[PDB]
Amino acid sequence: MTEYKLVVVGAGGVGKSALTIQLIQNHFVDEYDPTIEDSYRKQVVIDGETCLLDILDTAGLEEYSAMRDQYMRTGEGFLCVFAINNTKSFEDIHQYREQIKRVKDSDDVPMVLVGNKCDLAARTVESRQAQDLARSYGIPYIETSAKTRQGVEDAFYTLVREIRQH
């Protein structure tokens, strides 16, 4: 069957692991344990297609920034995550995109921009600001909450639908 190699990237603490774990394991991780690099694999049906999601959950802490080159090489699509209550994490997105662009030698890499923690009201990134960033990259913007499950499946399935357009 078709395997989709997804890679989740973004600054530390934005909810990359919580999003991935909610998708794959259907619970919310409340505590914060920083990730080095973890892999999840699950068979799912997306738009009638039985397929395998292979998801790489990467480190946001800059201590592990040297590992980015490797994982950006193997990935077929990238979930670029920031948190809507973390302006710096939104600003950081360009550096993740620019590296993906450089490593893939393409500005048509399948990606989705994800604004996580949308259950929180301490919003400093307005939806329209993120819509505009995603538009500049030619990709969709989706808001999610790993806590409530809002948008979680949608974000990952949307990334699969972007890979299929490549």
Of the two residues 123 and 161, which places its CB atom closer to Ca ion in the complex? 161
The answer to the question of residue 35 lying near Mg ion (CB under 5 A) is yes
CA–CA separation, 87 and 48 (whole Å): 38
d(CA 6, CA 119): 24
> Least distance from C-beta 6 to ligand GNP, angstroms?
15
State which residue, 145 or 158, has the beta carbon closest to ligand GNP: 145
Which DSSP symbol is given to 67?
A: G
CB of 108 to Ca ion, least distance (A): 5
Task: For the CB of residue 155, give the shortest distance to Mg ion in the complex, in Å.
Answer: 16
120 makes contact, choosing from Ca ion, ligand GNP, Mg ion, none, with CB < 5 to 8 Å by partner type, with ligand GNP
Q: In what order do the strands lie in the sheet with 37-46?
A: 37-46, 49-58, 2-9, 77-83, 111-116, 141-143
Q: Tell whether the torsion through CA atoms of 25, 79, 161 and 110 is positive or negative.
A: negative
Binding partner of 13, given Ca ion, ligand GNP, Mg ion, none, CB within 5-8 angstroms per partner class: ligand GNP
Residues that constitute the known binding site for GTP:
13-18, 29-35, 59-60, 116-119, 145-147
